[PDB]
């Protein structure tokens, strides 16, 4: 009965720890995936605004080429 008593309390400890651990890792996983995502949507927004500038060079280059 003593060994059973220490197993039960070891199990409660082991379960509280595993819950804290998994919440800790679930969160760091979410915060990392969310940062990547937010950064990728911004980088794609800048990438195509910067294409607008390459096309604005191309258009000013034509007005001299044609004159």
């Amino acid at each position: 009965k003593r060994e059973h008593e220490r197993e039960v309390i070891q199990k409660a400890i082991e379960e509280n720890n595993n819950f804290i651990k998994m919440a800790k890792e679930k969160l760091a996983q979410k915060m990392e995936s969310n940062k990547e995502n937010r950064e990728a949507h911004l980088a794609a927004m800048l990438e195509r605004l910067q294409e607008k500038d390459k096309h604005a060079e191309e258009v000013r280059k034509n007005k001299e080429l044609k004159e």
Binding site: L42, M45, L46, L49, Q50, K52, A56, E58, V59, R60, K61, N62, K63, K66
Partner: protein
């Protein structure tokens, strides 16, 4: 404080910008000298949204005045309140744009744009917490449409996480004969669909139809039209300027109003041009819309209603429930509770009770189809393409603006036809 940076470009842009600052300066108790001579402390609660505080207790508009031609500039200075604007915040060219969108966007405006951007940064880096920007401009001239949309994309590159809000004036053949106007409007609409978060569609064709049919003006002037505009811009910024709960800022407006990023073109309304039921019925009537589209030809994705004055809030609640109940088929059923209303206590000058209406309706496609039809009447002939190819523009750049706006109309039709089941 949540600051907005205000930008005025071009002929139309600067004139309607001036009357906005006159009207809200008066509502906030600020004379042409930037001094507060007001009655109540509610005029100063959120005064920092549109004003910098200069010591000597001077409130200076956080406004940037821009044009490729100095004429419009010098008129603002001598105008009422001209000496309340920061002198350094005037940025003018000389060459002008000659009503050519490619001159505003690619060539002339591109030479002046980096000079406006310098002014944006000074006002922006001086902000405790920058909400974003609001542009005023026409889509039919050259500086407002072309450089106005060039400055949008440039400002978005530097502040991609700020809200970009424009008051865009749309050309009517009833207001201007400049034949190249369906080109300019279609080319900037192509830009507005990609690069703004909210656009109030201020349709000159509706302002003309209001002045003539309702107000009964046989020859309405640009001064008559801009009276309707100033009252509308004061209406739809009331929630930004006075203490309140809903749509207190530009991002919360966008989140509540824009179910899909591209469908961000709003139909504004105003009443009177009265009891609480009459106000509610009028502000929903096609005749009080500033977008020249009949709502009963589409469906509301989302609506914002601002009531101003002293009135029973129980009564406003019941009347707004009333109009949704009896007009239920004209609100999309798959967006529950898509009509919010606000009541602010201070009415506009002159009125005891006003109502301002902001609609995201699939009937705005009516406005884009009137422009698309005038665009292709010229494009299929290749009429006036030389004013554009001469600035360096490709022909399929017109094809793309066209097909993108045709796409915007198809997507409004797509969600108007959508059902819950």
């Amino acid at each position: 404080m949540r600051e907005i940076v205000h930008i005025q470009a071009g002929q139309c842009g600067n004139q309607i910008g001036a009357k906005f600052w006159e009207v809200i300066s008066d509502e906030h108790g600020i004379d042409p000298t930037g001094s507060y001579h007001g009655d109540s402390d509610l005029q100063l609660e959120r005064i920092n949204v549109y004003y910098n505080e200069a010591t000597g207790n001077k409130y200076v508009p956080r406004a940037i005045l821009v044009d490729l031609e100095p004429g419009t500039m010098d008129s603002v200075r001598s105008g009422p309140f001209g000496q309340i604007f920061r002198p350094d915040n005037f940025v003018f060219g000389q060459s002008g744009a000659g009503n050519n969108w490619a001159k505003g966007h690619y060539t002339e405006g591109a030479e002046l744009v980096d000079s406006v951007l310098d002014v944006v940064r000074k006002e922006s880096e001086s902000c405790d917490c920058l909400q974003g920007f609001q542009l005023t401009h026409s889509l039919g001239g050259g500086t407002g449409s072309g450089m106005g949309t060039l400055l949008i994309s440039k400002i978005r590159e530097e502040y991609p996480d700020r809200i970009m809000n424009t008051f865009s004036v749309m050309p009517s053949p009833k207001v201007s004969d400049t034949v190249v106007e369906p080109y300019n409007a279609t080319l900037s609409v192509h830009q507005l669909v990609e690069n703004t978060d909210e656009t109030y569609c201020i349709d000159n064709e509706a302002l003309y139809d209001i002045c003539f049919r309702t107000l009964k003006l046989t020859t309405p002037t640009y001064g008559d039209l801009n009276h309707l505009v100033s009252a509308t811009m004061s209406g739809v910024t009331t929630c930004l300027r006075f203490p309140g709960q809903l749509n207190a800022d530009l991002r919360k407006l966008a989140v509540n109003m824009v179910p899909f990023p591209r469908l961000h073109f709003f139909m504004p309304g105003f009443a009177p041009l009265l009891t609480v039921p009459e106000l509610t019925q009028q502000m929903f009537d096609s005749k009080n819309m500033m977008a020249a589209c009949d709502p009963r030809h589409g469906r509301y994705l989302t609506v914002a209603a601002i009531f101003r004055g002293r009135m029973s809030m129980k009564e406003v609640d019941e009347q707004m429930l009333n109009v949704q109940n009896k007009n239920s088929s004209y609100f999309v059923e798959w967006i529950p509770n898509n009509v919010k209303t606000a009541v602010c206590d201070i009415p506009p000058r002159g009125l005891k009770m006003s109502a301002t209406f902001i609609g995201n309706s699939t009937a705005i496609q009516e406005l884009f189809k009137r422009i698309s039809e005038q665009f292709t009447a010229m494009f299929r002939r290749k009429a006036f393409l030389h004013w554009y190819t001469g600035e360096g523009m490709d022909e399929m750049e017109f094809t793309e603006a066209e097909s993108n706006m045709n796409d915007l109309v198809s997507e409004y039709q797509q969600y108007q036809d959508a059902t819950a089941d």
